[PDB]
RNA sequence: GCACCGCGCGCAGGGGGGCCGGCGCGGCAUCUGGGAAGACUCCUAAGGCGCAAGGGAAUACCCCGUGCGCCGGGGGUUG
């Protein structure tokens, strides 16, 4: 409740990094008498390898490893709740193939591969789920693909243009996330933030916000605020424009960090709405949301 | 510790290390009905004649490695003892079939694999008519 | 002239310009899929000079995965006449007939093939040779033929699925003996068609090794096929 | 560039295709009276935007890109109404949009005509796109395969009774089509009708005069009389 | 064209049979070990003209059969280009004798 | 690390190696870590690093 | 259904139909189910593209058997009309088969395209 | 083994290192060259291409104006 006490540090070895972190929290189970068993929360990570690691916070070391024959995993996420005991991780990678791992009953194993891109030069850099069965992935070849997890099919390939600010024509969608009403918010290599329609999968807005590329996004739990953190050490806050629906605009920006803002995540509960942004200056900055 | 073993012919039970009892069968076209009855987990006469004791449940245990068969024979009220699923029970149901040469002088002093072959042919041709030609 | 090879149950036929592989036909006077066969007698019949007793079916390594391993330098094949081999991926009864002729009448080969047309030709082959039993079931579901298959000695595995090591893993946890044998044929263009095949094969060997096999050897099938490996390994010993 | 544009029929807006292909084309929409940017409509394709057409009431516009994706994009909600696909188009070249008494929420134009690079021009009744949901695979009212080279021009009559579509790359490759019957007129053009290599066509405001201008630089005029 | 197609089918069957016979006549193998000790023990255990003529003969037969199949395949391709050059309408395919490649972009109506 | 393989000329004898990662973490691929940086610094150059120093 | 190596990605479908159009201009293409079957049986065929919009789908299902016997890659595009006017036919073509030769930029495109089809499989 | 009043040299090879310099394989945001390339673009010109004969030669290469065809330019009023 505003104390921010650092409890445990579990260090990895030499030549070992951590790129993505995902908690998997089960829903509230109920006993025979009306007592509440809360969700057991398991921590998964990737380390710029082909291996998803599950961490044991009780023993303060790594619990499990899973790996399939594919490239290095660059982004992953846990499928949201609509099933109940059958939840699955979806992981994008370098060479393209969206691998899909299974987690149930204390297990982490490489289940299958949904699809892969035709072009071998498509690298998957960010992933976010719109619903239980629709996965929105950003790619390096200027696309935001929207796959469907059950059959593994492809709903639509959203695209973005060249960057006309410098060279290097391929834009890179560094962070996608999904609003609660269905829209998709995506920060990319131009420092833009695009608002994509949820039903049609076309863009509805381009908001030029940053100068260098937007590296991480965060979306409020009720869908009212968007926080964008870029490589120009800049954090920008957007609220919807009054009147027309689906139109966002940048309320204000400020440079909170001293290097780029590589990751941030939000929390809103028990009288505490924060968003914690960690960058490359090792200082996690907590903003009130 | 009642274990439930299903071969192509019959069943065995090793509750007290060493084998305790059995149930034998041979050479009928109701063997494929037994086969479908454990493809689902339905009522089975060999199953019921095995699990029918007269006293009570004396300790609620029946070790069957497939969870589907376990929670389909949980629902039968004929004996109301509740079974257990495969709690990584590899050692039991692997060692009994590797050391099943010890069992063969007990219930069927013979080689019963010809009806295993016949049931395999019957099931495979049943599925080849399920994909009809 | 016919000699037996180093592998028991496998024969070679030698001539002035050729060297062919062959097996001892369990049903003499009968061929299966259009294969050449040689009649040889045991010596002691000079006045008659009729090739009466032994009929040998020529094993074709261009249609067999296992026969491409034996001519490649497979040190053991883990099976002798009288063993028990589970054949995973029996495509229309091509190699499983030669495996049945290797294991003989006191051996038995359990063929598993999910695909229905190859199941049709497999059962129409398997009617004659009685030492095979065919199972038309998905190899990714071993509890559907757990009643039908007893404990085996060798698992042969030629199935074109990306979770080939997982299929081998569940079938070996349910059917292979302690200290058993596994001969698996790995297809790189089936598992990952973009990585180097050495890397694909090394990842499959590592998956078996964490799946509690012991990789003894690996050899490529590359005068005969393209980007195919054969891993010969033992189970728990 | 500012080469390709379309002014709205109400005269208030004007859309310009932005020269940025990269697997999907956008077009910037400009208020006519003040000459300022007011919107932008982006579609996904392979080479961008083949053509587009404003709706008849003047709000939205239908953007037919290359590789067959056609997109109805409204001006009121300022996002995409829907996306459908031309039937079997390996790549679109031109589109036109005309008639009256169409669907009320899709601009009120009845017919859309999309001509591909093979030579085939499909004509769809726009009351068949509504399944606001658009069918992802509508069927054409009529597929015209009379011209063999890529369809370069297409133009509806302003009262929505004629449709003239022509290819530039053949001498005298122009056809004239009745609507709603979708039948090619067989009596004109004949073997000796001096069309030339047709580069632009234009129907009159009362639709009494067809003007055809070729690659030599000669306009010729034809009274339409029914 | 029909005659060249039948001769190409016969010659392709001959090439397949001859290449099978040549392979049957004449970092490949990897053996794994648990440790350097077992690897060195196996290395201790490793420390403990007719075919040339007939394989050169089969190799010359294989090269002549490949030349024959390549010649018949080039003949069949040249005859398909002759069909394209003599079609009743303008069809793409083939080079002119000036060198410029024929390509018509009309559709077959 | 791992002992390098020894080739007789036809076959290759190699020690298996998985003794690097017991329970700790898998070692990050330096080729993939430098690729994500090269997507972050595309054509852009660094500013001069420190103060007055050779 | 029975069209399991389906090409669903529109970028890959556009690449397949562009290579079909280039082979059609090179006269390196066999159009139709019977001509496709003849090219696959004779073994001159490098890649084979079937269409999944066939109204009885079972009239092109024999070609996967011959391609499994001859080890050539087959792939399914969505629309047979698109395949037809990609070849330049003005009819609906349900199966097409594009062949190989000695040395071509088209042959390099064929090798890359069957690599992409093997990525689908 | 050579010098038993010496360093060192000729040679077998056991392991690890400087991972210094090359080679091979793989990815590589861009940049450079080539091919293909959009059909508004180029398509060599008001003409050209093909097939089959005929005639001549630097005799491997080619050139020229008869019979069938395929386009193109120009001209061109609901045939």
UniProtKB/Swiss-Prot annotation, chain E:
Basic residues compositional bias, start-end: 98-109
Location relative to the cell: Nucleus, Nucleolus
Disulphide connectivity of cysteines: none
Superkingdom of the source species: Eukaryota
Region Disordered, annotated ranges: 88-109
Biased composition (Basic and acidic residues): 36-48
Family: Belongs to the UTP11 family.
Function, in words: Involved in nucleolar processing of pre-18S ribosomal RNA.
Subunit relationships: Component of the ribosomal small subunit (SSU) processome composed of at least 40 protein subunits and snoRNA U3. Interacts with snoRNA U3.
Name of this chain's protein: U3 small nucleolar RNA-associated protein 11
Annotated organism of origin: Chaetomium thermophilum (strain DSM 1495 / CBS 144.50 / IMI 039719) (Thermochaetoides thermophila)
Lineage of origin: Eukaryota, Fungi, Dikarya, Ascomycota, Pezizomycotina
Residues of the full protein shown: 109 to 270 of 270
């Amino acid at each position: 409740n505003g104390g921010w006490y650092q409890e445990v540090i579990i260090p990895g070895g030499k030549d070992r990094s951590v790129d993505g972190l995902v908690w998997v929290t089960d829903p509230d189970e109920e006993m025979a008498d009306g007592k509440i068993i809360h969700g057991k929360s398991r921590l998964f990570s990737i380390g710029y390898t082909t291996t998803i690691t599950e961490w044991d916070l009780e023993k303060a070391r790594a619990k499990k490893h899973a790996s399939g024959q594919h490239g290095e995993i660059w982004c992953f996420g846990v499928q949201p709740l609509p099933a109940a005991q059958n939840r699955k991780l979806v992981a994008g990678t370098v060479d393209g193939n969206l691998v899909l791992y299974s987690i149930e009953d204390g297990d982490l194993k490489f289940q299958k591969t949904l699809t892969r891109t035709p072009s071998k030069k498509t690298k998957f850099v960010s992933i976010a789920f719109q619903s239980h069965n629709i996965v929105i992935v950003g790619c390096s070849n200027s696309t935001i693909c929207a796959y469907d997890v059950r059959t593994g099919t492809m709903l639509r390939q959203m695209t973005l243009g060249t960057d006309l600010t410098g060279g290097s024509k391929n834009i890179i969608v560094w962070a996608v996330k999904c609003l609660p009403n269905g829209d998709i918010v995506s920060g990319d290599s131009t420092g833009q933030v695009c608002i994509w329609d949820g039903k049609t999968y076309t863009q509805a807005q381009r908001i030029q916000s940053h100068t260098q590329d937007v590296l991480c996004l965060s979306v409020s739990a009720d869908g009212s605020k968007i926080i964008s953190g870029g490589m120009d050490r800049r954090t920008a806050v957007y609220e919807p424009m009054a009147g027309q629906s689906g139109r966002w605009s940048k309320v204000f920006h400020r440079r909170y960090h001293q290097h780029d803002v590589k990751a941030m995540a939000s929390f809103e509960g028990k009288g505490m709405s924060v968003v914690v942004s960690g960058g490359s200056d090792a200082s996690p900055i907590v903003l009130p949301l | 510790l009642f274990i439930l073993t299903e071969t192509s012919a019959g069943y065995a039970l090793f509750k007290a290390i060493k084998y305790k009892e059995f149930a034998k069968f041979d050479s009928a076209a109701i063997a494929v009905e037994e086969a479908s009855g454990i493809l689902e987990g339905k009522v089975t006469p060999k199953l019921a004649s095995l699990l029918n004791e007269l006293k009570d449940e004396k300790k609620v245990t029946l070790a069957v490695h497939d969870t589907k068969l376990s929670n389909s024979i949980t629902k039968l009220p004929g004996i109301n003892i509740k079974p257990i699923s495969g709690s990584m029970t590899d050692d039991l149901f692997r060692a009994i079939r590797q050391h099943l040469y010890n069992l063969i002088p007990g219930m069927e002093p013979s080689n019963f694999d010809e009806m295993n072959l016949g049931l395999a042919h019957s099931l495979s041709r049943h599925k080849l008519k399920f994909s009809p030609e | 002239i016919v000699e037996p090879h180093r592998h028991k149950g496998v024969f070679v036929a030698r001539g002035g310009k050729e060297d062919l592989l062959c097996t001892a036909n369990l049903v003499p006077g009968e061929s299966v899929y259009g294969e050449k066969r040689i009649s040889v007698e045991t010596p002691g019949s000079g006045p008659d000079a009729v090739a009466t007793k032994t009929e040998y079916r020529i094993w074709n390594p261009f249609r067999s995965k296992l026969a491409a391993g034996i001519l490649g330098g497979l040190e053991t094949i883990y099976m002798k006449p009288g063993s028990k081999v589970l054949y995973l991926g029996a495509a229309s009864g091509t190699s499983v007939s030669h495996v049945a002729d290797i294991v003989g009448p006191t051996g038995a080969v359990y063929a598993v093939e999910f695909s229905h047309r190859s199941g049709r030709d497999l059962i129409n082959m398997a009617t004659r040779r009685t030492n095979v039993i065919p199972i038309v079931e998905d190899a990714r579901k071993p509890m559907a033929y757990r009643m039908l298959v007893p404990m085996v000695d060798v698992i042969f595995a030629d199935v074109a699925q990306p979770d080939q090591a997982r299929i081998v893993g569940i079938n070996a946890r349910l059917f292979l003996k302690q200290g058993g044998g596994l001969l698996i044929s790995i297809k790189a263009s089936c598992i990952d068609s973009t990585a180097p095949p050495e890397q694909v094969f090394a990842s499959e060997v590592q998956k078996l090794r964490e799946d509690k096999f012991f990789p003894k050897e690996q050899l490529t099938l590359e005068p005969y096929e393209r980007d195919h490996a054969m891993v010969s390994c033992v189970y728990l010993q | 560039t500012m080469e390709r544009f379309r002014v709205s029929p109400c005269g208030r807006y004007m859309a310009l295709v932005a020269s940025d292909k990269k697997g999907g084309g956008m077009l910037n929409i400009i208020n006519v009276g003040t000459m300022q940017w007011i919107a932008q409509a982006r579609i996904d394709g392979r080479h961008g935007v083949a053509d587009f057409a404003w709706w008849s009431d003047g709000n939205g516009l239908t953007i037919a890109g290359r590789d067959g994706q056609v997109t109805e994009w409204s001006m009121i909600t300022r996002r995409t109404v829907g996306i459908w696909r031309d039937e079997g188009s390996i790549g679109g070249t031109v589109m036109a949009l005309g008639g009256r008494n169409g669907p009320a929420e899709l601009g009120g134009d009845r017919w859309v005509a999309i001509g591909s690079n093979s030579g085939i021009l499909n004509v769809y009744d726009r009351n068949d796109l509504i399944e606001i949901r658009i069918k992802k695979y509508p069927t054409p009212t009529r597929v015209f395969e009379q011209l063999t080279t890529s369809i370069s021009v297409v133009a509806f009559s302003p009262d929505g009774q004629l449709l003239a579509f022509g290819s530039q790359h053949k001498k005298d490759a122009l056809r004239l089509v009745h609507l709603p019957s979708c039948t090619v007129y067989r009596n004109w053009p004949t073997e000796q009708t001096p069309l030339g290599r047709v580069t632009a066509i234009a129907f009159s405001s009362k639709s009494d005069v067809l003007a055809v201008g070729n690659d030599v630089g000669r306009v010729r005029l034809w009274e339409i009389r029914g | 064209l029909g005659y060249v197609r039948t001769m190409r089918n016969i010659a392709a069957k001959e090439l397949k049979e001859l290449e099978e016979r040549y392979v049957l006549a004449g970092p490949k193998k990897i053996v794994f070990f648990e440790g350097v000790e077992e690897r060195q023990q196996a290395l201790e255990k490793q420390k403990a003209r007719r075919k040339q003529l007939v394989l050169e003969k089969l190799a010359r037969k294989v090269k002549a059969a490949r030349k024959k199949l390549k010649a018949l395949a080039d003949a069949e391709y040249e005859l398909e280009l002759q069909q394209a050059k003599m079609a009743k309408t303008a069809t793409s395919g083939g080079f002119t004798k000036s060198g410029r490649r024929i390509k018509v972009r009309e559709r077959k109506r | 690390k791992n002992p390098k393989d020894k080739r007789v000329g036809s076959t290759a004898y190699r020690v298996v190696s998985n003794g690097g990662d017991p329970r700790l973490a898998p070692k990050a691929k330096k080729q993939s870590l430098n690729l994500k940086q090269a997507l972050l610094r595309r054509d852009r150059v660094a500013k001069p690093r420190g103060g007055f120093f050779v | 259904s029975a069209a399991w190596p389906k090409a669903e990605d529109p970028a890959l479908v556009q690449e397949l139909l562009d290579c079909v159009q280039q082979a059609s201009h090179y006269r390196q293409l066999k159009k139709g189910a019977n001509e496709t079957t003849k090219s696959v049986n004779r073994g001159t065929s490098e890649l084979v593209i079937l269409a999944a919009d066939t109204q009885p789908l079972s009239i092109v299902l024999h070609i996967p058997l011959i391609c499994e016997e001859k080890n050539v890659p087959y792939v399914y595009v969505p629309s047979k009309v698109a395949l037809g006017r990609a070849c330049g036919v003005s009819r609906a073509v349900i199966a097409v088969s594009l062949t190989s030769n000695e040395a071509s930029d088209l042959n390099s495109k064929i090798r890359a395209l069957r690599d992409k089809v093997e990525r689908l499989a």
